[PDB]
Design a protein around this ligand. Structure first.
Ligand SMILES: O=C1N[C@H]2[C@H](CS[C@H]2CCCCNC(=O)c2ccc3c(c2)C(=O)c2ccccc2C3=O)N1
Ligand SMILES: O=C1N[C@H]2[C@H](CS[C@H]2CCCCNC(=O)c2ccc3c(c2)C(=O)c2ccccc2C3=O)N1
Ligand SMILES: O=C1N[C@H]2[C@H](CS[C@H]2CCCCNC(=O)c2ccc3c(c2)C(=O)c2ccccc2C3=O)N1
Ligand SMILES: O=C1N[C@H]2[C@H](CS[C@H]2CCCCNC(=O)c2ccc3c(c2)C(=O)c2ccccc2C3=O)N1
Lengths: 122, 122, 122, 122
């Protein structure tokens, strides 16, 4: 599997830092530090990955969540990243993400941002 | 907070069943059973929620992930749901989701489905 | 085809009004009036639809765009709706949408909202 | 405005070709040729852009639609791209997109792909 390939420190195009441990069972646990937004220091993350991916050259599906509350700040929001790990000399995690803020019902139509992050080991 | 409001069994518009425990610290843990797709029985989920939401009538941001591997099937894919819990007499979890499949690099452009699920307690 | 089924006035869950003419060639032209956001009166829309859909009970794919500039306001943003028309006694257009604002490069990560609108004829 | 900056031929990361004319009034018209998918030759596109963007360094919001029917093929689907044009020496159009296929109601949950394309003039 890709437990060893996924475990470690990853960096996205914004300079954010994603530190993760992949468990043998499919668990992802770690911390996230965003270079942008209403965020400071590390936030807990948890997620899941496919611990027995296909053997045909396909990537490894995974996802995780951060709720943007820690001991320093609370942005009343959560981001989920959904994507796939691609191994090899220039390994990457290619993701799309959804960032939902708590809103009133009147403002729920503008609650959710969407974007895409690519994580590398360098 | 909404630990007690979120903890329990939820059902979406497709007939899927979302069983979750909210921890005092922001953790979400539980199981998901999809009424649709290449899925059978329960799958592990994990996520996060805002354990100290705003007090102005806003919803409570949260997200979770399921990797679609269990002891029965492996769809080589993962879904993340990002959304907000809205309390009250007809409590709901309103979500948008991203479902990424592991793909070859040539097919990565068609790796990710997007949709929206509303969960109720009934 | 669904030229006659799509042409006319549609209303979404927010109270917005979508007035459209479907051309024999796949064109969509009309106006949109949003019940929410930094918007007033009607805005031009244009789009495309599948003018020869499948005959197996599938919906009819379509999409359109509004740039949120008219003679009254300019929100420096554009929404695209992507979805499908479903005919019958309770015809609907089920959509997902992406609303991008012009931003500086530093803020591009938070440029795009995502949501979902359902349009009915009533 | 950016009528002259947007008008012309653009290429994305997949090798697709986007040929567009921007009108003084906010119109986008042209053709799209996809390097991937169930697509051959050129397809009509139409969209809208902000013809009076902010002057603070922000990008120019725009969107367009392609229904994937032409004289050669019909994929019973439509893509909308929502994004912003960024001018300068290395001008770009940064987009996110939604690709909806016509589906039966039972399959509507898996009707829509999401992705991101960056277009350059080179
Ligand atoms: O590494 C990274 N960093 C970024 C990406 C995805 S997570 C993100 C880092 C997130 C850090 C905590 N939230 C914020 O600061 C934040 C700032 C502004 C907005 C929101 C959140 C938000 O919810 C929102 C929702 C709906 C309409 C508008 C808005 C906003 O205007 N990748
Ligand atoms: O309760 C629920 N159930 C559903 C929603 C969101 S999770 C979903 C249940 C998911 C169950 C496991 N996956 C599947 O069966 C599955 C079936 C078909 C496709 C995919 C996955 C997929 O990745 C995909 C990605 C890119 C292009 C096309 C495709 C597919 O054509 N809410
Ligand atoms: O009928 C409808 N009405 C609505 C939906 C989809 S179109 C929408 C109506 C749109 C009317 C013109 N824009 C706005 O007022 C507007 C207001 C607030 C925001 C934005 C735009 C925006 O871009 C944005 C982008 C990124 C981060 C945060 C933000 C915002 O906070 N369906
Ligand atoms: O330049 C480009 N090219 C690409 C991107 C965005 S447009 C795209 C080019 C599109 C060309 C016409 N459609 C296709 O061939 C096509 C192929 C496979 C699928 C679909 C469409 C689809 O709807 C879909 C929807 C829901 C679940 C699964 C599926 C598919 O598995 N940028």
């Amino acid at each position: 599997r890709d437990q060893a390939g996924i475990t470690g420190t990853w960096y996205n195009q914004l300079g954010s830092t994603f530190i993760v441990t992949a468990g043998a069972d499919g668990a992802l646990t770690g911390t996230y530090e965003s270079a942008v937004g209403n965020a400071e220091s590390r936030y807990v993350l948890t997620g899941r990955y496919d611990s027995a991916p296909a053997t045909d050259g396909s990537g490894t599906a995974l996802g995780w969540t951060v709720a943007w509350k820690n001991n320093y700040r609370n942005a009343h929001s959560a981001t989920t990243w959904s994507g796939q790990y691609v191994g090899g000399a220039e390994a990457r995690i290619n993701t799309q993400w959804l960032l939902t803020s708590g809103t009133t019902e009147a403002n729920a139509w503008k609650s959710t941002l969407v974007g895409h992050d690519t994580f590398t080991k360098v």
